[PDB]
Subunit: 56 residues, 2 copies
Amino acid sequence: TFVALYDYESRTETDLSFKKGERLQIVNNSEGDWWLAHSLTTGRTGYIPSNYVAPS
Amino acid sequence: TFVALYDYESRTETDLSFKKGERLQIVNNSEGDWWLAHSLTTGRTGYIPSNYVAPS
């Protein structure tokens, strides 16, 4: 259980909007945390599910 | 630097598609890791930027 420090407005269909002060619980899911990543292989960039990758 | 273990197809405008074997670098950004969260205050659910919250 966490508390929001700041308002946040959603940018896509999958993010959660919330106001400062809201109480949130983290949902365990298979994808793991999401990270912003750059593909050295393709040059594209964007968020990935961290359980899909491993250190080289 | 990481290596993709699985293919991943993007679901939104902000996630990165990639194939097994690709090499990825994590981008440091202010939002921090993103987590799937449920709002006990509003009942809505979806991804949030973890630097926007703190443990209660």
